[PDB]
């Protein structure tokens, strides 16, 4: 109400007077459905510039951080009404920040139905459950038989709300959550999301097995961009559409200005021969008109594929890609080391985003595009 013989009830129904004079109030205060003990003793007059105020030790621990704000507001407040309103707003923000302290499940809703839904899914999809029963992980199989796991976080009462779902594959997973949706509902949704990008995996596992795959080393299911070795110290990279995987992915080469040169020239005049019905590897072998070194040496150091500046492979994951346009050197280099070297050099002239200069080993013209 406007008057505090009714507004005091409407806003702190739990907070009520003991003393004849309405000077000793006691009771509780509600906050997120939690009734906290409170005793509050005003002066003879209804001035808050003095207002004795003790609590629970619970409450004083929770208000460690704001007792100065209490000292401020007790003295600055016009009325006990607005004082307590602001107090409850404060309590809510306090627990909102300290929201890590909050969970308790109802068993017969939760611990009953959840194992029925597990038997619904299959106990063999069951890969893990948490000692809290907070987390649970499950398995889905691509029709090839690739395992795609997924994690799920369960509230106190699960089907009331969405569980927090965490999945490996790259596209934003959408789970249409109704309370009628159960574990198998979201499992079918998981499968439908898997079956959309199924034929992508059918090319990806092929590429994983066949060729000298380079730099999504141990590629997860998220990986839509790949890198392949070919020839020697010339590597290609690919990025594929999960929706049209056999469609031509966008690609380019890394390597030499005499090895990468006729590779693209063949590609330009055979891309029209791209038959998307075949496998991607098979299409490439004819489009590029070559065989791969199909793991032909894979990960065995003959000192060929090495920076020559830093003398390393996978410098910050960076590959020896920049090479010499020379038959005699063919010394491959990183980006960063070659950049920093041709930085200080006097002859190193800079165009838009190019650095020219001499190869460190052979002193022949070498071009770096950033």
């Amino acid at each position: 109400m406007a008057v505090t013989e009714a507004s005091l009830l409407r806003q702190c129904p739990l907070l009520l007077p003991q003393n004849r004079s309405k000077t000793v109030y006691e009771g509780f205060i509600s906050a997120q459905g939690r009734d906290f003990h409170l005793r509050i003793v005003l002066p003879e007059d209804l001035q808050l510039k003095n207002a004795r105020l003790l609590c629970s030790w619970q409450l004083r621990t929770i208000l460690s951080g704001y007792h100065r704000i209490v000292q401020q507001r007790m003295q600055h407040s016009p009325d006990l009404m607005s004082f307590m309103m602001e107090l409850k707003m404060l309590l809510e923000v306090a627990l909102k920040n300290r929201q890590e302290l909050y969970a308790l499940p109802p068993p017969p809703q939760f611990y009953s139905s959840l194992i029925e839904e597990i038997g619904t899914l299959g106990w063999d999809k069951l890969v893990y459950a948490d000692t809290c029963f907070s987390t649970i992980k499950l398995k889905a199989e691509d029709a090839s038989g690739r395992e795609h796991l997924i994690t799920l976080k369960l509230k106190a009462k699960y089907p009331a709300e969405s569980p927090d779902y965490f999945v490996d594959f790259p596209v934003p997973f959408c789970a249409s959550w109704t309370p009628q949706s159960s574990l198998i509902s979201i499992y079918s949704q998981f499968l439908a999301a898997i079956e959309s990008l199924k034929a992508f995996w059918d090319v990806m596992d092929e590429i994983d097995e066949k060729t000298w795959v380079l730099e999504p080393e141990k590629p997860p299911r998220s990986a839509t961009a790949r890198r392949i070795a070919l020839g020697n110290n010339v590597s290609i990279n690919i990025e594929v559409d999960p929706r049209h995987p056999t469609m031509l992915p966008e690609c380019f080469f890394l390597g030499a200005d005499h090895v990468v040169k006729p590779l693209g020239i063949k590609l330009s005049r055979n891309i029209h021969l791209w038959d998307p019905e075949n496998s991607v590897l098979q299409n490439l072998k004819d489009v590029l008109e070559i065989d791969f070194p199909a793991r032909a040496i894979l990960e065995k150091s003959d000192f060929t594929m090495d920076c020559g500046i830093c003398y390393a492979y996978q410098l910050d994951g960076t590959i020896p890609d920049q090479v010499c346009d020379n038959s005699q050197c063919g010394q491959p280099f990183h980006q960063i080391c070659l950049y920093e070297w041709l930085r200080g050099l006097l002859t190193s002239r800079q165009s838009f985003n190019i650095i020219f200069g001499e190869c460190p080993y052979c002193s022949k013209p070498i071009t770096l595009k950033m």
Binding site: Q350, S351, F352, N353
Partner: protein, 217 residues
């Protein structure tokens, strides 16, 4: 936007389109960020040989670009692109636009937009370059254009300009060859910010242009 596509699709009289155009121009600060560009796209499709001046005036009056705050960047960019395409694939937009900021003479309350569009137009079709120089000298001597302007201009919208830095220098070149210290100071600030925010090649071109000024000038 759907409404607009549909109105492009249906059999209509144009007098109604005009009403709607005015209507959106009122309802033009009162739009969310994202669609904005396509609305403007519509407008600039919708415009004609004659109405152009007035609509632009209203537009030039209603666009702010201090108001639009990943909080405005992508969309602004896309906007500029759109405009860029518009004034690429027709000419008279630019002459009208210039006219509009040129005859905005009494206005000592000039907004950011104007310079940005000037750069752009300088970068694009070039017959008018001498027109642009002329007008820019004239507003500078008038003192309607000043330097905290350029400050906030390069403090925000630079990203637009990176890919036309060469325009800035080709201009500053013609700025320092003139008299009237304020003009020369403007060109200075140009060279300064250009070296400041942009990349190595820019910096290099800065130094290389200043040296030329020194030795020859």
């Amino acid at each position: 936007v759907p409404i607009l596509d549909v109105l492009s699709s249906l059999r209509l009289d144009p007098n109604f389109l005009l009403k709607v155009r005015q209507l959106v121009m009122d309802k033009l600060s009162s739009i969310r960020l994202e669609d904005l560009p396509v609305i403007i796209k519509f407008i600039l499709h919708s415009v004609t040989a004659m109405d152009t001046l007035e609509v632009i005036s209203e537009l030039r009056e209603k666009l702010d670009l201090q108001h639009c705050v990943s909080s405005g960047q992508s969309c602004i960019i896309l906007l500029f692109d759109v405009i860029k395409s518009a004034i690429r694939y027709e000419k008279t937009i630019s002459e009208a636009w210039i006219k509009a900021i040129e005859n905005t003479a009494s206005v000592s309350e000039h907004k950011v937009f104007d310079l940005v569009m000037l750069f752009i137009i300088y970068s694009t079709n070039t017959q008018t370059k001498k027109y642009i120089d002329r007008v820019l000298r004239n507003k500078i001597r008038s003192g309607c254009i000043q330097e905290q302007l350029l400050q906030s201009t390069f403090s925000v919208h630079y990203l637009v300009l990176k890919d036309m830095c060469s325009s800035i220098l080709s201009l500053a070149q013609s700025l320092l060859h003139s008299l009237d210290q304020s003009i020369i100071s403007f060109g200075s600030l140009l060279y300064k910010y250009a070296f400041k925010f942009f990349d190595t090649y820019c910096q290099q071109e800065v130094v290389g242009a200043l040296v030329t000024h020194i030795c020859s000038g």
